[PDB]
Subunit: 386 residues, 4 copies
Amino acid sequence: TPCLVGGAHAFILKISSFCGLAPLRFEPRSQEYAVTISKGKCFYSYILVTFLVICTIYGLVAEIGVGVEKSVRMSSRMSQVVSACDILVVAVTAGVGVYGAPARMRTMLSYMENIVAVDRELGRHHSAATERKLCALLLLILLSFTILLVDDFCFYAMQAGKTGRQWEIVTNYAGFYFLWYIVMVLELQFAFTALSLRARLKLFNEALNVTASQVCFVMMKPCLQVPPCEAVGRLSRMRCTLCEVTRHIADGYGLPLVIILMSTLLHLIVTPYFLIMEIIVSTHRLHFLVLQFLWCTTHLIRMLVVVEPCHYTIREGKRTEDILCRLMTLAPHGGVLSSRLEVLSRLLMLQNISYSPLGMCTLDRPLMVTVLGAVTTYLVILIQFQ
Amino acid sequence: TPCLVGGAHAFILKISSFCGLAPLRFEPRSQEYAVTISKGKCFYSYILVTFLVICTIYGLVAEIGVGVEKSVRMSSRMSQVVSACDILVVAVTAGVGVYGAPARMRTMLSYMENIVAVDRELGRHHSAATERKLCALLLLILLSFTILLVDDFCFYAMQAGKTGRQWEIVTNYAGFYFLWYIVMVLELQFAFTALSLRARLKLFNEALNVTASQVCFVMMKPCLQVPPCEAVGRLSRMRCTLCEVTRHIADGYGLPLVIILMSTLLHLIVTPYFLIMEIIVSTHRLHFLVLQFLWCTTHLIRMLVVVEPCHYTIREGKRTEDILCRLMTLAPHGGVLSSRLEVLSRLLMLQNISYSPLGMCTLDRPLMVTVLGAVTTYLVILIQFQ
Amino acid sequence: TPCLVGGAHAFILKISSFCGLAPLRFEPRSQEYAVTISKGKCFYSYILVTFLVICTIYGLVAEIGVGVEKSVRMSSRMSQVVSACDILVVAVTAGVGVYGAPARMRTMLSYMENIVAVDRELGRHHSAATERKLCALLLLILLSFTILLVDDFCFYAMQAGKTGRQWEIVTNYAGFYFLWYIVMVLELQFAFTALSLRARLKLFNEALNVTASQVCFVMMKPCLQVPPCEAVGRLSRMRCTLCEVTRHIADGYGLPLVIILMSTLLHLIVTPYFLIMEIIVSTHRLHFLVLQFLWCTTHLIRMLVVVEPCHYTIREGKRTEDILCRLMTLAPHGGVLSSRLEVLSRLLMLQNISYSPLGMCTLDRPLMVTVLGAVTTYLVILIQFQ
Amino acid sequence: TPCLVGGAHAFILKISSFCGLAPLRFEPRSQEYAVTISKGKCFYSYILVTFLVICTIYGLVAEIGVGVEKSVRMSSRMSQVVSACDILVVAVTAGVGVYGAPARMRTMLSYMENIVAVDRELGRHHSAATERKLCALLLLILLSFTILLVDDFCFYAMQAGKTGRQWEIVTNYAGFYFLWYIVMVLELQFAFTALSLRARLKLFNEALNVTASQVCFVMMKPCLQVPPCEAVGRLSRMRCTLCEVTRHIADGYGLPLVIILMSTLLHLIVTPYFLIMEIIVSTHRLHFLVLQFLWCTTHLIRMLVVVEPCHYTIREGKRTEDILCRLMTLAPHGGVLSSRLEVLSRLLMLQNISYSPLGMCTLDRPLMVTVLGAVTTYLVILIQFQ
C-alpha cells in the first residue's frame, strides 16, 4: 500500500497524468488507486512539454517575423510584445508544472502516507455523493475551459482563413493552446489537492466538536471511543500532521501558483483593456466580443479556483480556533483535559494552516482584493488615455 | 419565548419588515417583541423585491434605449454605462439583502437565544434613555436619507418636465429609489445589530472590571454575587458566546456588506467626479450642485454607518484585553483565580471579536482610510485629464 | 500635590499655555510645577482661538473675493481652492487643538498622578543634562519654525507691497500664521509628552535588565532592593500603568494627530508640486524657491516630530520583549520567579505600547513610508502632465 | 581569541577591507582569521571614501556645468536631475557604508564572540564544500558586477571619444564607478553575514529536531549527549543569543539597507523607463540596449541579494516553530521537558528572528512584491505619456 489515493483528488491525477503533470502508475484497488512514480511517464511528460514549448516558441517567432499587417492575432508592435509575453509566461507556467511534476508527485506520496494514516484514525474523507459532486464540478470546469479554447482556436483560424493562412495560425498556436490546457489542469490539480486536505481538516474540527459534546478509531460514524483526555492529544498530533501536509503542498505548488497569479494579473489587465478598446471604438464583431467576455470570466474563474480552497482551509483553521475556545471554557478546570487543551491552544497559536506560495503572498480572499485593486488601477490609467 | 428581541435592534427589525429585509411576525410582550419566521412575509418580501428589480431593469432599459440627447439622467455614452452599473449594483445589493433575509433572520433567532441567555446572566443591555436615543438616531438617519431621495426624485422629475417626459423618469426610477431605500435600511439593520452586540460586549467588560474591583446573576446593578473564581469562568463562557454571535452576524451580513463597500467605492469615485465637473466647467444649477454635495455626504455617512460599529466592537475587545492585563497583575499569584485569568488570556489570544465580511476585508477605521486613499487616487487621475 | 509636572514636558506646557493648548496654572515647586485646570485660561484660550479662526476666515474670504489677478498669494482658480483647503485644514487643526485642550489637560493630570507614582517607584525620568538638551531641542525647533513663518510673512508682504496692498495681505494672513504657530506648538506638545512616557518605559526596561543581572524603591541609582520575585510583579503593574497612560495620550491626541497627518499629506503633495513648477518653467525668484524648499523641509520635520517618538516607544516595547525572553531563559525553572515571568509574558503578548490615533493608523516609521509612497505617486501623476 | 571569524563571511570581510567597509586586521589561524579593529585601516577607509565622494561631486558638477548637448551621459534637463540624484544617492550609500564601518565592525566583533560560543556549543556552521560553494557564488556575483561596470565605463568612454572628450567622462565617472563597487561590496557583506547567521539558526533547528528524535557539546556529528530536559534550555539560551545577534546585524545595516532599497526603487523605475524609451522610439544602438537590460537584471539581482537571506532566516524561524509544535505534541505530558517546551514556546511567541532595517520595513519576499508593485505603477504612468 504505497499511496492509496482516491476520490476527486485521484480523478484529476489521472487527467493530469496524460498532460504530464502527474507521472504516476495507477493501480486500481476496486475502491481507490495505488499510485507510484513511473519513469516511462516521467520521460513522456518531459518530451511532451519540451516538444510543446519548442512548437510554441517556433509559432511565436513565425507570428512575429511575418510582420504586423499580415499577422491576424497580432496587429501592432505593442500587441506583438504583450502577446509574446502572454505566450512566454504560459510556456513558463507549463514548463514549471510539468518539469517539476515528478518531484511534486514524490512529495505527494510522501505526505499521502500520513494522510492515509490520518484518514484511518478519523474515518473517510468524503461521502460518495459529495465525491461525485466534486468530480462533476471538476469535469464541468475542464469541459468549459476546453470548449472555450476550441472556440477561440476555431475563431482565430477562420478569421485567418480569409487571407489564406488558415493553417499557419493553427501550426503556430496548437502548442500554445495545449500549454493553456496543461496550465489549467495544473490549477485544477492544486485546487483539488487543497480541497481534499481541507475536507480532512473539517473532519478534524468535527472530531474536536464531538469530544466537546462528551457522548462516549477516535472518530466513528457522533460518539467517541477513547476518553477526551487522549482524544485531544491524538487530535493535536493529527493537526500537526495536517499542518505538515499543507506546508508540503504549498512547497510543491509555490512556483506554479506564483507564476499563475502573475499570469492572472497580466490577463485581467490585458483582456479587459482590449475588450473595452473593441467597444468604444467600434465593435463590428460579435464573436470576438463574446470571446473576450468569456476569457475575462475564465481568468476570474481561474483566480477563484486558485484562491478559494485556500480561503476555505483558513476558515477551517478559524473554526478549529473557535471550537478550541468553546472546549476550554468547558471541561473540569484543574483536570488533565484542561492541560491537553492548553497544549492544543499553544499549537494553534504557534502555527496555522495556510497557503503561502514561495512566501511572497498568502492565498486568500484579501489577496484577490489586492489583485483586482491593482488591475482596476492599471485599467483606469490605460483606458483613459484612449 | 422563541426570540424576545427588543430595543433599537427591534425597531429597525419592524422597519425592515416592510422593506422585506426582516420577514418576522412581531408579538408584543409589553416590554419586548417575540419574533418568529413567517412564510407570508417571506413570500411578500420575495415578490416585492422581484417586482422592484424587474421594474428597475425595465426603467434602465427604457432610459438606455431612448438614446442620449433625449434622456435627462443620462447625457453621454460613458454616463450611460456608469449609471447602468450604479443601478445594477444597487439592484444586486437589494436582491442579496431581501432574498437572503429569511436565512439571515433564522440565524438571527439562532444566536438571539444565546444573547437572551447572556443578557439574563449579565442584566439588561441598554437603559431606556439610551435606547430612545438610539431609536431617535436611527429615525434621524432614515428620515434624512428619505428626504434626500425624495428631493432627488423631484428634482430629476421636474428637470424632465420641461421636455414633456415628466412621468417617464418617474416610471423608470421609482423602483430604483425603492431599492435605494431598501439598501440603506439593510445597512441600518446591520449597524444596529452590531451596536447591540457591542453594548453586550461593553457590559461584559464592565463585569470583568467589577470582578477586578473585588467588592463582593453574576452582575447586578457595582458588586459581584459569585466569587471571582467562578465569575471569571462564566465570563469566559459568555465571551465565547459573544464571539460566536459576532461570527454569525458577520456570516449573515458578509455578502451585503461587501457589495455595499463596492457601491461605496463606486459612488465616492463617481459623485465627486461629476460634482467637480459641474464646478470647473459651469455650475448654472444650484439644486444639482447641492444634491451632489448631499449625495457625497450621504455616501460617506453610509460608509461610516457600516464601519463604525465594527470599530467600536474592536475597541471593546482591546478594552477587555487591557482589563484582563490589569486583572492578571493583581489577584493572588498561585491561586485558582490566576489560572482562570490564564484561560481567559488564552481565549483572548486565540480568538478576537471582529467583523470580516466574507473574509476579504476587516471592517474598521483603517479600511475606510484605504477606501478614501483609493478614491482620491482615482479622482486625481480622472479629474486631471479634464 | 495635584500633578507635579516638570522637565521638558512642562516646558512645552508653559509655552503652549499662551497658545491656548494648555490652560493650566503653573505653581513652581522649586523643582517642578504643580499644574491645575484654570477656568480663566480656558476662557482665554477659547476666545483667542475663536478670534483667530474668525480672522482667518475673513482673510480667506477677502483674498478670494478680490479676484485672481489682483491677489498675490492666489494666482489661479486651482490655487484658490488648494490655498483655501490649506487654510481650512490648518484652522480645523488649531480649533481641535485649542477647543479640546481643557479635556486633554484633564486627562493629562489624570494619568500624571500615576506617572508620578511610577517615577517614585523607579526614580527620576531624565538627568538634568538630558532635560536641558531636550529643552534646547524644543526651543531650536520652535525658533526655526517661527523664523520660517516670519520670513514667509515678510516675503509675501513685500511682494504685495509693489501693488500697494502691503497691509491687506498682513490683515488676511496674520491669523493664519498664528494658527500655524499654534498647530506646531501642539505637535511639539504631543511629541514631548510621548518622549517623557518613552523615557519612563526605558527606565522600566532598565529595571527589568537589572533584576536580570541579580545584584541584590524597586530601582536605585545597578542594584535591586526587593527580591526578583516581587520586583517582577511590581514591574508588571508599572507596565500596565504605562500602557494605560499611553492609551490616554493616544485618546487625547488622536483627532489632532489624524488632522495633522492629513495636512502633512496635503502639504507634501502641494509644496513640492509648486516648487517643481517654479523650477522647470522659470525660477526668476530666489527667495520664493528657498522658502518653498524650507517649507518642504519643515513639513518633513513636522511629520518626523509626530512619528519618531511613537517609533521610539515601539522600539522600547520590542526591547522589553527581548529582555523578558532573556529573563525567561535564565532563573530557576520551577521557581516562583518563572511564573512571574510567565505572567509578564502574557501581559506583553496581550497588550503592547503603541500610538494609534483614532485607530485609523499606527504612528510608526512604516506609516511615513506609506505617506511618502503616496506623496510620490500623486506627484509623479501631477508633474508629468505639465 | 578576539573574534576568530572564518568561511565565506570572512572572505567578504577581506574583500571589503580594501573597499573600506571592514577596517580589520586579519590574523590567519590556519583555520580561520582573528580580526581586530585597526586604526590605520579606519583612516585609510575614511580618506578613500572622502576622496571618492569629492571626485564624484566634482565629476557631477563638471558634467552638469558643461551643458546639455555637449555632455554624453546627460542629454536633457530631466536627465541631468535624475542622473544627479542617482550619483548623490550612490555617494550617500557609499558614505554611510564606509563612515559607519568601524562602528559596524565593533558591533560585529561584539556579537561574534557569542556566535563563537554558539558554534562551539553546536559544532561548526558549514561544511568545507558548501563554504567553497558560497565563496564561489560571492566571487561570481562580484566578478559579474565588476565586468558590467567595466563594460559600462568603456562604452560611455568610447561614445564620448567621437566628440573628443574621451578622458573627461573617465575623470568624471571613475569615482562614481568606484562608489558603485563599494556599494555592491557592502550589499554582499550584509548578505553573507545574514547567510552565516541563518546557517547557525538552521543548525539550531536541526538540534531541536534531534532532541525530538530522542536517540541519546549538546550536538555532535544524530545523537544528543545531554538529556532532552537541559538540552531544550540550552537551545532556548542559544536562540536568544541568535535573536540578539540578528538584532545587532539589523541595527548595524539598517541605514545602508534603507538607502539601498531607495536606490533599488529609483533604478528599477529609471533604467526600465529609458530602456523602453530607447525601444519604441528608435534603437540604433545594440550595446546601449544590452547594457540597459543587464543593468535592470543587476538591480533586480541586488534587490534579491539584499532580501533573500532575510527571507531564509524568516523561513528558518517558521521551521523552528513547526519543530517546537511537533515536540510539544510528543514528550511526557506532565514531565519537566514539557515545561521547558512551554518556555521555548513563550520565547518563540514573544520574539522572532527577522530583519527590519531602521524599523521602516521588513526585509522579506512580500517587500519585493510591494517594491515591484510600486515600480510598475510608476512605469505604467510614465511610459503611457510618451
